[PDB]
Structure formats: C-alpha cells, structure tokens
Amino acid sequence: SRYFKVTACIPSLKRVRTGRELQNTFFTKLVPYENWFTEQQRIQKAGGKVLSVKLFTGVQGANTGVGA
Amino acid sequence: SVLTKAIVNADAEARYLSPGELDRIKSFVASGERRLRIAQTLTEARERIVKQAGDQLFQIRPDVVSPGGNAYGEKMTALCLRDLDYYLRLVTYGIVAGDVTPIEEIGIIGVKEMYNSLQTPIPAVAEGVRAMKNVATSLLSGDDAAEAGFYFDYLVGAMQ
Amino acid sequence: SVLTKAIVNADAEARYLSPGELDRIKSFVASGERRLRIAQTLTEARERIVKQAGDQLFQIRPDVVSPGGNAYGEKMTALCLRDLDYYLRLVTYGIVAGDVTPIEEIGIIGVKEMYNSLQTPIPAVAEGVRAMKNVATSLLSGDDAAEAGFYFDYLVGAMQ
Amino acid sequence: SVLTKAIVNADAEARYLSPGELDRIKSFVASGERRLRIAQTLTEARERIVKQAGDQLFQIRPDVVSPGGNAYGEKMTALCLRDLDYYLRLVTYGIVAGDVTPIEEIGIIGVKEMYNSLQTPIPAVAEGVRAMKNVATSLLSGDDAAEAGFYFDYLVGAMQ
Amino acid sequence: MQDAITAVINNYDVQGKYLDGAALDKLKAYFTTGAVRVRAAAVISSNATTIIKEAAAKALIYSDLTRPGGNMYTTRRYAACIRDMDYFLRYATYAMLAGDPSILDERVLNGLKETYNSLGVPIAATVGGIQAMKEVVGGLVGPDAAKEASIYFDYLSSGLS
Amino acid sequence: MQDAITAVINNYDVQGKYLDGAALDKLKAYFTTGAVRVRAAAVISSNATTIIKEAAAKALIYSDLTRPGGNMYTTRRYAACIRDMDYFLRYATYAMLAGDPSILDERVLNGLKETYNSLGVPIAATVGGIQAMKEVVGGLVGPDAAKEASIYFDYLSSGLS
Amino acid sequence: MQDAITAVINNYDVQGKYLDGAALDKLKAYFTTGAVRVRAAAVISSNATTIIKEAAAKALIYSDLTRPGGNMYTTRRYAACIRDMDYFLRYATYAMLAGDPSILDERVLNGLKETYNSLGVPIAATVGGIQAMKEVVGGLVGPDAAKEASIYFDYLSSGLS
Amino acid sequence: MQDAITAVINNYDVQGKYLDGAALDKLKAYFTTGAVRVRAAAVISSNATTIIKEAAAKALIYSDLTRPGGNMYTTRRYAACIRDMDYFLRYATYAMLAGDPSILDERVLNGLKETYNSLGVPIAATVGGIQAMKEVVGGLVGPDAAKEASIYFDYLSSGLS
Amino acid sequence: MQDAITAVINNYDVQGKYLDGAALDKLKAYFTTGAVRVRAAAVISSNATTIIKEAAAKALIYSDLTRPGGNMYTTRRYAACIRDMDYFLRYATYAMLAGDPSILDERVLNGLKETYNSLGVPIAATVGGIQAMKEVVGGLVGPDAAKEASIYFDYLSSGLS
Amino acid sequence: QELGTPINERSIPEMYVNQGVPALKRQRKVFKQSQATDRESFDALVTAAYVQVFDKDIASYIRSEFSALESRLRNRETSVKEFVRLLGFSALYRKQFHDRYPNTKVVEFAFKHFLGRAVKNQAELIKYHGLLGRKGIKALIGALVDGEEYGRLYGEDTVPSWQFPTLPAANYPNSVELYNRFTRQDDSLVVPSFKPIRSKMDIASMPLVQAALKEQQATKTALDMSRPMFLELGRSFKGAD
Ligand SMILES: *C[C@@H](*)[C@H]1/C(=C/c2[nH]c(/C=C3N=C(/C=C4\NC(=O)C(CC)=C4C)C(C)=C\3CCC(=O)O)c(CCC(=O)O)c2C)NC(=O)[C@@H]1C
Ligand SMILES: *C[C@@H](*)[C@H]1/C(=C/c2[nH]c(/C=C3N=C(/C=C4\NC(=O)C(CC)=C4C)C(C)=C\3CCC(=O)O)c(CCC(=O)O)c2C)NC(=O)[C@@H]1C
Ligand SMILES: *C[C@@H](*)[C@H]1/C(=C/c2[nH]c(/C=C3N=C(/C=C4\NC(=O)C(CC)=C4C)C(C)=C\3CCC(=O)O)c(CCC(=O)O)c2C)NC(=O)[C@@H]1C
Ligand SMILES: *[C@H](C)[C@H]1/C(=C/c2[nH]c(/C=C3N=C(/C=C4\NC(=O)C(CC)=C4C)C(C)=C\3CCC(=O)O)c(CCC(=O)O)c2C)NC(=O)[C@@H]1C
Ligand SMILES: *[C@H](C)[C@H]1/C(=C/c2[nH]c(/C=C3N=C(/C=C4\NC(=O)C(CC)=C4C)C(C)=C\3CCC(=O)O)c(CCC(=O)O)c2C)NC(=O)[C@@H]1C
Ligand SMILES: *[C@H](C)[C@H]1/C(=C/c2[nH]c(/C=C3N=C(/C=C4\NC(=O)C(CC)=C4C)C(C)=C\3CCC(=O)O)c(CCC(=O)O)c2C)NC(=O)[C@@H]1C
Ligand SMILES: *[C@H](C)[C@H]1/C(=C/c2[nH]c(/C=C3N=C(/C=C4\NC(=O)C(CC)=C4C)C(C)=C\3CCC(=O)O)c(CCC(=O)O)c2C)NC(=O)[C@@H]1C
Ligand SMILES: *[C@H](C)[C@H]1/C(=C/c2[nH]c(/C=C3N=C(/C=C4\NC(=O)C(CC)=C4C)C(C)=C\3CCC(=O)O)c(CCC(=O)O)c2C)NC(=O)[C@@H]1C
Known part of the structure; x- marks a missing residue:
C-alpha cells in the first residue's frame, strides 16, 4: 500500500546502444514497498546510482494498514 | 477489517x-x-486466561521450562507470558475489527523469523495459544465462544 | 457467489x-x-413486473418506440421485453447466489459491445431496469425489497 | 564437484x-x-565417530533425550544416530568430490522443512554435527583435520 | 489505508493498550452510522454518471474552459477532466464508506497538486466541480448522509487548495 | 471454479429457465449443511500440520520410500512430497467448502498424473498418503462432516488412480 | 550435469554406501587421466575456429546446401550453421573434461532432433559435419586423447541420428 | 508473411534467378491495381462496424444461436463472436492490400479449426457470417475491387470449412 | 486414392452440386493431357532399372553409405535401399498418371518418416536419391512432361524432408 | 553462371521459402517508452503492452479498466516495467491465466507473458513453482519482473515481447509451441517436468579410465617398491586365497 518514489541513473557499460535510449538510463518512478527492496539491489548490482528516494504514499509510524 | 478488505478489493x-x-x-x-x-x-x-494458558502449556510441555528449554528461568517464563498477553490483545483486536488484517500486520508476518532468531519453539507457542483458546472459550457463551475460537484457530494456523 | 469469491481470494x-x-x-x-x-x-x-416496467419505460422514453428508435415496431418491442425477462432472471439468480458473479459472467461483460453493435440505448435499458426495480419492490417487504434493490442497483451501475 | 562447477560457470x-x-x-x-x-x-x-558424537551431543543437550525431546527413547535415539551417520557419509562425499555440490543436493536443500515437519531441533542437529567434526578431527593430521573441518563447518552453517 | 476501526486499533497498538471505554465508544459511534454509509454509497454508485453530468453542467461547461484556449477544450482534455471527476466521486465514496480520509490522502491527493501545476490544470475550476458534485451527492443521498458525504468532498477540495 | 449454487445456476442458465422447485430443493439441501462445513474447515486449518505428519507416519515414512533408492529420499524430495500433501489437504478443504469437485479437477488433477509419470513419483504411494490424510480428517472433524470431507479425498484418489 | 566423480558419488549415494575399493579404483583411474584431458581441451579451445572451418569445407559447403534453396543458403543460415558447429565443439570439450556424456544428454541432445525436423535442417548433413570435426580434433589432440575425444563426437552423432 | 512483390522475389531467390519477363509482368499486373486496393481498404476501414452489423443481422442473430443453448448466447459469447468477426474483416483487408493469402494462413487459419472444435463454436455459422461480410463488402466497395476482396473471404471460408 | 477427375467429382459432391462450367473446364484440361502422361509413364516403366542405377551411382554409392558401418552396407541393406528407390519411382509414375499427389500422401508418405527414424535410415540421403531420380526422369521423358514428372518427385522429397 | 545455379532444380518454389526460423521472428515490432513519446506513439505502446500480457485474445476486451495506470504511465510517474508489473497484479490476469489452470501451468503462462520464453530447466521450475505455491501470484510476478534476466533483456522501458531462444536445448521448440497456440486452443502444460536422462555409458568403460585401471592392477599386484628388500621378499600378493 506504500509506494516509493525513486530516481535512479543506470549507465550502459557495454554495446553503447543506438536509438535515443533516454528513459532507459535516467528515470524517476513509483515503486511498491514490497518490490522496492529487490529492485534497489538490482539497480546497484547493475552498476547504477540511486539518486533519490521518497516515501510518498505511506506513513512513517505505520503499525496498521501497511500490509494492505 | 472487513471494511478495509472490501475497499481494498474494490x-x-x-x-x-x-x-x-x-x-x-x-x-x-x-x-x-x-x-x-x-x-x-x-x-x-x-489475566486469568493468561495464567491458565501458562499452566496448561507448562503441563503439556515441561521441557520448555527445563534447563535445555527456551523458557527456562523465571524471567524467561515471564517473557513467554507477556508474549501470550500480546497475542491475546491481538485476538481482541481481530475480534473487534471483524477480520485478521491488524493481526497480520502486527504479529504473524516475520514471526517465523521471530522465533527462529530467538530459538523459540513455534509448536510450543501454538500450544500455548490453544490453551488460551480453551480458557477464553470457558468464559463465553456458545456463539461468542465459537466466534472467538475462529480467531484463536487463525492464530494457531498462522503459527505453523 | 460469496463462496466462490472467498475461495478464489484464498x-x-x-x-x-x-x-x-x-x-x-x-x-x-x-x-x-x-x-x-x-x-x-x-x-x-x-410477467407483471416485466409488463409494468415496459409501461413506465415507454412512458419515460417514447422515442425508443418512435421510428427513429431501436425498439420501433411490435417485434422490436417484444425483443426489448425479452431482454427485460433475461435481466429479471439474472437478478433472481444473483439474489439466490448472494453475489454478482453469475450475473457478471452472463449479462454485463461485453454488453456494451453487444448494444453498440445493435445500436440500442444503454441508458434506456437502464431506465427499464429501474422501472423493474420499482415494480419488484412494490411486491416485496422492506428488508427483502432493499435486498433485491441492491442487485437492481448493481445492474443499473454495470450498464453505465 | 570442482569440474562440474567450473563447467557450469563456463x-x-x-x-x-x-x-x-x-x-x-x-x-x-x-x-x-x-x-x-x-x-x-x-x-x-x-562407527566410532558416530557413537562418540552421539554421546557428546546427548551430554550437551539432554533435553532431546528427555520426555519432551524429539529423540526420547531407544528408537528415537537410533534414528538420530542414523541421521548423524548420513551426514558423515555426505561429508566424506563432499571431501572426495572437492566441492559441496553433492552435499547440497542430497541433504541440505529442504532440510528446514524436513526438521520442521519432524519437529526436530535444528540447532541440536548442528551441535551433533559439531561433535562429529571434533571426533573426526581427533583422528586426522592437522592439514587433513582442517580440510575436513571446512566441510563440517559448511554443513553447520547450512543447517542454520 | 485505514478506516475508523483500524485507526483506533493502531492508535492503541502504538501504546500497546487493550481497548478501553473510550475506544469502545468511538467504535460504537462508527457502528451506529453503518447502514447510512451503505445506502448513500449504493445511491452514489447508481447515479454516478448523472452526478458527473450535472456537476459539469453547473461548474465547468458553458464557459471559457470548454472554448478554445481553455484547459477543458478538446475531447482529450475533456476526457481527462471527466475521468478525474469520476476518480473523485469513487474515492469520495470509498472514504465515506471507510469513515476516514486516509484513502483519499494516500491514493489521490499525493502529487495531484504539483501535477496539476505542471500540466496547467485549473485548481479553482477543479475545486468548483468537486463542490458541485458534493452538492449533487447531498441532494441525492438525503439528510441521513448529506453532511457525512460532504465532509470528504470538503477534504478533497481543501487538499487540492 | 464452481460450487453447488453456481452449478445449479449455470445448469438453469443453459436452458434459460427461472429457478423452480427442484433447483430450490437442491440449493436448500446445500444450505442446510452450511455450518458443519465451516466448522470442519476451521478444524482442518487448525490441524493442518498434524494431519500431514500423521498421514506421512502412517503411509509413507519408515519404508523404502524414505531410504536410499526411494522416491521420497533426500531432503528436497521429502519437502516436495510434504508440499504436495499440503496442496492436497488445502484443495480438499476448498472443495468441501464449495460442495463441488470442480476445483479439485480444475486446479489439481489436470495433468498431475502425467507430471508424476514424467518425474517418476509413485502414484500408489501418493494415493495411500491421500487416504491416510482422509482417515485423519475423518477422525478430527467428527461424524457431522466426516463423510462430506471424505468424498473429496476419495475424489482425489480416484482421479489420480 | 555430472562428471565421473559425481557419477560415482551418486551411484554410491543411491545405495547409501560408503566408498569402497571399487569406488576408489574408479576415482584413481579418473584422477590419473587428469592432465591429458586438460591439455586436449586447451588445444581444442586454441584451435576452435580452424576446426570449424576445415569441417565445413570438407563436409558442407561447395554443394547444394550452400547453393540457392539449400538449408545453408543465405548469410542468415550460414552463420547459424557455423554457430551450431561451434556449440557442438564446445559441449564436446565440456564432455571430454568431465569424462561423462551426461552433459551431452542434458544440454545438447534433448529436443535437438525434433527442433531439427521443425526447422527443416538436414540431420545427415549435421552428422557429417560432426564427424568431420571429430576427424580434425583427433588429428589435433595427438595419440594421447584421440580415442577419448572421438568417443564423445560419436556419442553426439549417434544421438542425433 | 508475404505480399505479391516479396512472394515473387522469394520465389525467384529460391531458384537463384534474376527477375525476367514473366516476373516483371506479374509485378506489373500487381502494380496496375494498387490504387483500387487502397481505396477499397479505406472504405472497409471506414465502414467496419456497420459491415459486421449487417452481417450479424443477416446471418447469426434472430435464431437459436442467440437463444439459450446457442453458442453465441450471453453477452460474453456475443462479444466474442463479434470480435472474431472483426478479426476476419481486418485480416481480409490485410490480405486484399497485400495481394496474398500468406498472412491469412500464417496468423488466422493456423489452428483455428481445432480451436473452434475445442470451444464448440459452429464452423458452419462462422462460414455463413464470413460470407455475409463478403456480400456486404462487395456491396460497399463496388465493381472495382469486389471480386478481389471476395477472393480472400472465399479463402478464409474454404480454410475454415 | 483419387485422380483429377475423382478430385473434382468429390469437391462438387461435398457441395452437392451438378457439374458447371468450371468443373467442365477442369475436366477438359485434364483430358487434353492424356496422351502425354501415357507416353511418359511408358518411358519410365521401360527405363525403370536404368534410372535407379544412375541415381544410385550419382547420389548414394562410392561413399561411407556403402563402406562398412554405413546404412547401405551389406547386401541385405543394399537390396532394401534399391527396392525403396523402385517403390518411389513406381508411386511417382502412378501419381503422374493420375494427375494428383493424393496417392503419394496415402500410400508413400504416411508414416514413412517415422519409419525412417525407427530404422536409422538417412533421410537426407533418401532425398538425394529421389532428386537424382528426378533429374534422370526429367532427362528421359522429354520436354513435354518434364515439369509434370518433376513436380511429383519434388512433392515426395519435400514430404520426406 | 552455372556455379550459382541450384543443382537439383527447385521444381516447386516456395517449398524452400518457408524453411528455417519462422518469419514472425523478424516480422514484428518492439515498443520502447524512450522512443514512444507523443500521444500517437504512446497509445501504440499501451495497446502493445496489453498484448504481450493477456496474449492478444482477451486483450481486445479491455476498454477502460486500466485507466489510472495509463494516466500515471503517460505522466511518467511509473515506468513500463511498473506498468507491466501492475498489469500482472490485476484481477483480470488472475481470473484469466491462473484461476483455470493447475499451479504448474500458471508458472508456464507467467513465464511466456513476462519474459517471452518457456521454462529453461527443472532447476527453475523448482524455484518458481515452489514460490508461487508459497506466496501466490503477487510474489511470482514480482520475482519474474525483478529478475536479472528481465533487467538484462528489457530494462526500464520496454514491452517484454516474444523471444525465440537458441539456448538452452529444447527451449526453442518449447517456446515456439507456446507461441503458436491461441488462447484456449490447447491447455496441455507443454513442459510438465524434465525427465531424468540417466546414464547408458559406464565411466569405467572409457578409453582413458579403462587404460589406467589395468595399469593400476599391475602396479599394485606385481612389482615391489622402496621399502627394504628383506621386507619386500616376504610378501603374499593374495590376501585370502
Ligand atoms: C542427532 C539426531 C537428531 C534427531 C533426529 C531425528 N530424525 C528423525 C527422523 C528422520 N530423519 C530423516 C532424515 C533424512 N532423510 C534423508 O534423506 C536425509 C538426508 C541424507 C536425512 C537427514 C528422515 C527421513 C526421518 C523419518 C524416518 C525415516 O527415516 O523413515 C527422528 C524421528 C522422528 C519421529 O517422529 O519419529 C529423529 C528424532 N533428533 C534429535 O533430537 C537430534 C537433533
Ligand atoms: C461470429 C462469432 C462466432 C462465435 C465465436 C466465438 N469465439 C470464441 C472464442 C475465441 N475465438 C478466438 C479466435 C481467434 N483468435 C485469434 O488469434 C484468431 C485469428 C487472429 C481468431 C479467429 C479464440 C482464440 C477464442 C478463445 C479465447 C477468447 O474467448 O477470446 C467464443 C467464446 C467461447 C467460450 O465461451 O469459451 C465464441 C462464442 N460463436 C458463434 O456462435 C459464432 C458462429
Ligand atoms: C551445420 C549447420 C546445419 C544447419 C543448422 C541451422 N540451425 C538453425 C537454427 C537453430 N539451431 C538451433 C540449435 C540449438 N539449440 C540449442 O539449444 C543448441 C545447443 C545450445 C543448439 C545446437 C536452434 C534452437 C535454432 C533455431 C533458433 C535460432 O536460429 O537460433 C538454422 C537457422 C534456421 C532459421 O534461421 O530459420 C540453421 C541453418 N543448417 C544446415 O544446412 C546445416 C546442416
Ligand atoms: C477536470 C475536472 C479538470 C481537468 C483535468 C485534467 N487532468 C489531466 C491529466 C491528469 N489527471 C490525472 C489524474 C489522476 N491520476 C490518478 O491516478 C488519479 C487518482 C486515481 C487522478 C485524479 C493525471 C495523473 C493526469 C496526467 C496524465 C493524463 O493526462 O492522463 C488533464 C490533461 C492535461 C494535458 O492535456 O496534458 C486535464 C485536462 N481539466 C479541466 O479543465 C478541469 C478543471
Ligand atoms: C508425496 C506424498 C509424494 C512425492 C512427491 C513429489 N513431488 C515432486 C514434485 C512436484 N510435485 C508437484 C505438484 C503439484 N503441482 C501442482 O500444481 C499441484 C496441485 C495444485 C501439485 C500436487 C510439481 C509441479 C512438482 C515438480 C516441481 C517441484 O519439484 O516443485 C517431487 C520432487 C521430484 C524431483 O525430485 O524431481 C516429489 C518427490 N514423493 C513421494 O515419495 C510421495 C509419493
Ligand atoms: C569476391 C569479390 C571476394 C571473395 C569471395 C569468395 N567467396 C568464396 C566462397 C563462398 N562465398 C559464399 C557466399 C554466399 N553465400 C550466400 O548465401 C551469400 C548471400 C547471397 C553469399 C554471398 C559461399 C557460401 C561460399 C562457400 C562456397 C559455396 O558457395 O559453396 C570464396 C572461396 C573460399 C574458399 O574456397 O575457401 C571466395 C574466394 N574472395 C575475395 O578475395 C574477393 C574480395
Ligand atoms: C429493451 C428494454 C431495449 C431494447 C432492446 C433490444 N434488443 C434487441 C436485440 C437483442 N437483444 C439481445 C440480448 C441478449 N442476449 C443475451 O444473451 C443477453 C444476456 C442475457 C441479452 C440481454 C440479443 C441477443 C438480441 C439480438 C436478437 C436475438 O436475440 O436473436 C433489439 C432488436 C434490435 C434489432 O435491430 O432488431 C432491441 C430493440 N430496445 C429498446 O429501445 C430498449 C431500451
Ligand atoms: C570382382 C571380382 C568383380 C566385380 C566387382 C565390382 N564391384 C563393384 C562395386 C561394388 N561392389 C560392392 C559390394 C559389396 N557391398 C557390400 O556390402 C558387400 C558385402 C560385404 C559387397 C560385396 C558395392 C557396394 C559396390 C559399389 C561401390 C561401393 O562399394 O561404394 C564394381 C564397380 C561397378 C560400378 O558400376 O562402379 C565392380 C566392377 N566386377 C567384376 O567383373 C568382377 C567379377
């Protein structure tokens, strides 16, 4: 139910690529709480920097309604 | 709650x-x-529910209070009783809410890691919760007893 | 039904x-x-409900039985009445089932495409369903009248 | 083994x-x-290593041979000793192969569900493996003792 | 998201407190108005399109918004505005059923303001349309749930403004 | 998936017929036994792990299956067999609650036989485990829902064999 | 996959037996032939492209296969055929290092035949190319590992045909 | 998929022939009717829904198919039948534009017969609806492209039948 | 089996139609090519053994197929292979006389492929022999029926491959 | 001239045109968000995303149910990966491709829709079917979308689309059989499980190992070694005979 708003930059370290390729390297997008964990690992394992993270939807205290 | 579940699905x-x-x-x-x-x-x-659940659990599983048991010691038993009180409180929360959402968000997700990191017997905790169910069912009429027993059974099933 | 929905979610x-x-x-x-x-x-x-809902529908929207309307002619009107009987039978099915799964699978999914192909006024059919709700609640006690009115309201909202 | 791992990586x-x-x-x-x-x-x-490891494990954790213990009784203890023999055989397999590949497929993946369904103490099995490691390293020279202890420690870490 | 029951439950969870007389009173105050929320929500679901049409007729159309140079001009922009209105209606129904503005805050209001500033959407016109929808909903539902539904429309308008 | 009520509803929908006295009799017969199914399902969910353990101890383990050369040998294969047993128990519970074997045919038995032939899994041992679980469930639930639960375990066994 | 060591270990694990004189004899016989396999694999890896070129020249090209309408006509299919020959050579090297054709069965031969009838590839031409590569590899590796290298190419050819 | 030009090009490439008088005459014959195909395709695209409407009215509806027990009974099945009708119309337009039934064989008729056999769809009713669409399209397009449009509808009908 | 006449007759029987102008045109076109087919069949029947001899010499023998271990090593297999070539030639003659490959589908290609994988026969070598016979037959029959003769050999080769 | 002619004249053309991989491998389009800017290109990307998922048949029924997702995607609040993930979380996907098939076939349907291939091997079936049954659809979809293969193949902004794999073995025919199936055309699971392939050639029968075993016998039985000759002359080569 909580959504992370994350901005990241993933450079290309092989084959350079040719067509316009702009949303594939620097992006900002909402990510769910449950999948943000395994995606942050993927971003930093693909040699990508995580510029910004925002809590956005959720509440810091939580304790109920988070798991919905 | 039922409201939360229905609204989330819709x-x-x-x-x-x-x-x-x-x-x-x-x-x-x-x-x-x-x-x-x-x-x-x-x-x-x-309080009476917690005490009778504790005695029933200890009669069923004396080894837990034995030297090679997780609940050996007066404060080890006190902490187990406090967790029992916690789960009883969660049972009341679920009963008032009409569904198991707060119980899930509080005390079943990560509880396998809970008792694996603490080396606590999950089947023993389930037996203690069942003793709680018996004690609470002894203090209610039949329909209300079954209604609370549904939530106690849900807690026992989650502790599995 | 409610059993199907609960089992599917579980x-x-x-x-x-x-x-x-x-x-x-x-x-x-x-x-x-x-x-x-x-x-x-x-x-x-x-039969009485269908005939009456026909009367209020034709009173409210005479243009549908006007020659620029979908249901112009005796057999076009008969087909509208038969669609009315279909929806009434679906409402009875949903009432006995306790939820909207059979009605959804039988008469709402693709209904927009079907009525657009036939060039029939969906708001007019919704008005006919509302007249059905009025006629049906006229023959029912308040609790069960509201119970049937919930399903009629669901059909009206689905045709929208 | 080493060859299988290298070939798979290539x-x-x-x-x-x-x-x-x-x-x-x-x-x-x-x-x-x-x-x-x-x-x-x-x-x-x-046989000697299995027997001594069983005695050492029963000394360190007597609760398993207690009434509430998983290995209470002669046949329960026989099954525990047979499992310890199984793990010794797996350790010899791993030492011969030079990699932990056969050990993982034979007696590590799913071991958690194994001992959870059997209600056996996984830390107790780990302690039994440690006693087996001590008995094994008592019968080996220093370099060979360290070489076997690597695989024994791998088993201890996996059963965890 | 949370309803009234879940908000009370988590406010007691943070203190580790059993439910007491005050929490029971709050839950009873929620429970005594349960059926009114249900009937009003059913009425709103039945008349969703008519409410949107009447609110648009009173607040948006027949103005410079729908003419060239307006933010309502062109079929695409009109579709966006009416889809937004339908979103507001459905989420107002959800909030009034749950007895809490948590769902409206979580799933609508986050980002909507600066999104509208970036796109050029008129916040004042959106608030006016929301208020017209609120008045239509209050007219349809009746005395029993008029104010009860209007509080969440006012929440939406205050969040936007 | 289908239950008794939905099955009768579709069986009349295919003829385009309103519900009559016969269909009313059938769904009345289902409605009369609603609570017993719920209580038995709650008991099964309560004793899920113990039922699996008792069925395994009575039908599978302490044999050549759990020894070297046995299909259920090794921790991975044992975990797979117990997960299959848990699948059978949960889907038997669902079918018993729904009052129909459609979910059993429709989420379990489709292709399970050929998958078991491809993997080499023993169908006879699987059927024996299913019958042991059926006997344990019949013992636990009591006379009220024993036959009703047991018919779906027999359905699973007859579909597998 | 599995090598000689894992094959012995699995064959003893299925019986649940500790290693005995026969198992140690098999392991010693494998260990003695260690350096020869490594040298042969290094030679094949260094001369991979020349082997493919000579095998293609001797068995495939200058014929109806490369003339129009042939299966190896067009660059799109010529590159695919030489890539397939490279795959066969690489997996033969893996099999020679492991001392077991289990890798050939698991990761080369399964589905390959029916794939070739699906695509229209000539199985006999593929077998001829494999045998040409076998002759070239046997020439390169020397008398030490000629038979050991040739056995896996014969295994691949017999599996395909 | 292939059009007329790529079909000729591939047919000569497989024989390794330069384009000769016959191939040039074939290409000239296709090019001479390019504009009529484009005009007919534009007309069919503009009148797509109406053609399906008259085809359904003259072939399917007002019969036992739409009644209970019919294949196109219920809104879901009616929508599926009209979507299939639209599929046939769009792919017939593609075939008439490309001047070749290769796309129809590749992406329409492949497995359609046995899929309809599995689902219980009436193949005779489908052929009747296709012929109704053929008559409507022939009426709309005119003498210029009537027969050329009709040949691909006949191709689809013969493939299904 | 069926010839051109029976194919037209059955294709009109399935519609229950009397013979029309198109059917009569097809029958006339078949009847005009009567003497050519008879002459070609007589030439092939007279030169049957020589065609097989030249095709075998050009495509099969003097190679690993006839050298030991080959699939046509030993007299028992050589006689079988030449008998198979004679079978292909005879059925091609039948199909050429009938003007229809239905006999080839019914009595030659039915299960021939899977029989060849069962026995281990090289299908590519069989196709090469068939095309060698095709070249020899095209040389023998003359320019009148060369294309007609060649099409059925191509049909057989494409069915096998 | 004659060295570029076919030999064995292609008497029936376009019997050789269709050989090789199907034309569908290269006769289809790939959609990328980075080059799908503007409204006209965005709608094509959206309608293509509904066809990679949902397999083109019940994709035509979608009218406006996924309208909040499309708005966020158009406003660049969520990437195409997030759009594809949320499409797999919907009740329509669960109703269509999970509620009517066994748990093992849902994994196959999930793979072909969110990765473009079939299941690689038995060690991947065990990993992914053993997670779907443990935690349901919303974990299996998250595992596929967040996997390393998805990140390599499509990255942030790209519709998944069918891939015709070359490796591993049997992956190409398994994938193509899934590809050329209409929805509800066939419901056999194609890859139920990978059979054990067993062993038909004993490792001790190889040339090198068998050649070393005989030497091992001779060296142990016949000849002596580096202990004193008085010890080596009082040895019995047989042990119990
Ligand atoms: C030190 C002994 C510990 C212990 C063990 C214990 N185990 C069992 C029963 C079984 N253990 C196994 C084990 C395996 N099967 C395999 O394939 C492998 C991999 C090689 C293993 C490790 C199995 C299958 C069983 C079931 C019986 C059977 O083998 O047929 C028991 C008995 C439990 C019961 O309910 O009877 C015990 C007690 N107990 C301890 O206290 C120690 C920690
Ligand atoms: C005039 C309508 C007739 C009819 C049809 C009918 N079809 C279905 C279901 C499907 N139809 C298709 C068709 C295609 N998929 C393709 O890719 C193509 C070519 C590009 C075609 C033609 C498929 C795959 C299905 C199954 C999936 C789906 O439903 O979309 C149905 C529904 C059957 C059911 O309820 O299960 C119907 C009714 N029915 C009639 O009565 C007409 C003759
Ligand atoms: C000597 C070459 C012969 C030949 C081959 C040919 N093959 C293809 C296409 C494919 N080959 C494979 C092979 C494999 N899949 C596997 O998993 C492995 C092991 C890693 C193998 C060896 C596959 C799957 C394909 C299809 C997919 C692809 O193209 O990658 C082709 C091309 C066919 C086409 O493009 O349609 C050719 C030509 N052809 C000959 O004439 C030679 C005898
Ligand atoms: C309508 C009364 C007013 C109006 C609105 C308008 N909105 C947009 C664009 C967007 N609106 C949304 C809204 C939502 N997305 C959500 O998920 C939710 C809650 C579930 C909401 C409310 C978003 C995200 C957008 C941007 C993406 C999109 O366009 O879909 C427009 C379009 C602007 C443009 O052309 O770029 C418009 C016009 N316009 C009026 O005149 C009214 C005052
Ligand atoms: C246990 C009583 C028996 C047994 C079983 C066994 N099963 C497997 C592997 C699988 N089992 C399944 C099962 C299902 N998939 C479904 O969708 C359903 C119904 C919803 C079922 C029941 C599947 C798909 C597999 C394959 C994938 C996996 O392993 O998870 C094994 C493992 C075999 C192996 O090692 O390859 C075993 C052992 N074994 C016994 O001895 C009992 C008779
Ligand atoms: C000529 C200007 C240059 C050159 C050429 C050269 N080519 C070969 C051999 C072959 N060339 C091909 C080509 C193709 N096959 C195709 O499908 C296509 C696409 C239409 C092409 C272009 C092939 C298949 C062969 C192999 C033989 C065969 O066709 O059967 C050679 C001979 C190489 C050798 O004998 O080893 C040569 C020399 N060489 C130059 O130096 C020029 C610059
Ligand atoms: C009546 C209140 C309105 C109206 C209706 C109208 N309907 C038709 C024709 C058809 N309607 C259906 C309907 C259904 N088939 C189903 O399976 C279901 C679900 C239970 C429904 C609702 C069908 C199939 C037809 C086609 C004919 C047939 O049944 O065979 C018409 C005739 C249109 C024509 O062009 O002939 C009409 C007029 N018209 C109104 O004005 C009312 C608002
Ligand atoms: C020699 C005394 C007489 C003779 C022989 C002759 N043989 C051939 C050609 C072939 N002979 C064989 C024979 C066999 N294949 C088998 O499997 C066996 C059984 C072990 C035999 C005996 C074959 C297969 C051939 C074909 C070529 C090949 O082997 O690949 C010829 C050549 C004929 C030609 O037309 O080329 C001849 C001349 N001829 C005499 O006059 C002698 C009396």
Missing part, C-alpha cells in the same frame, strides 16, 4: 462496491455490538 | 479462508431461506 | 574454459589423492 478492481460486499458490511455493523461485548469480556478476563 | 493468496470470510459464509447460509423466498416471489411475479 | 557464459579454470582443475586433480585418502580414513572409523 479499489484494486477499480469499481464500486458489490452487493455481496455491501451485505457483508451490513452484517459486520450489525454484529459489532456482540463483537465489542466479547472483546470487553476477554479484556476483563485477560 | 486460493490466490495461497492460504486457508480467513475468519471474516468464514463469518460471511455463515451469514450467507443463514440468509439463504429469505433469499429463496425473495426469488420465489419475483419468479412468480415475473 | 557454460553460463557460453565460452571455452579459461586457463585459470584449467589451473583450478589441475590443483583439484593434484589434491584428489589426498582427498580420497582422507575420505577412506574417515570411512574406516565411521
């Missing part, structure tokens, strides 16, 4: 509430008074 | 049924006899 | 083996004679 589907969900909401609001009476009864009888 | 989450789902199943099985009585009442009064 | 990238991988293979084939000699040395004394 919002995920992107539609207004269905007649079945409306009927279940009406049934929940009708049964709310009986639910709060049951919760008040259990809250009043929280 | 299977999708890979878990046994929740206490709230069990409670709603118990409530549905408790309300079954009243649901059957309502269904018997409407199925006995099927 | 096949994942779809290329011929690099000279570094051939160097690892050469080192493994050089150490193979010592590895098989260590394995036969452990195999000759399999």
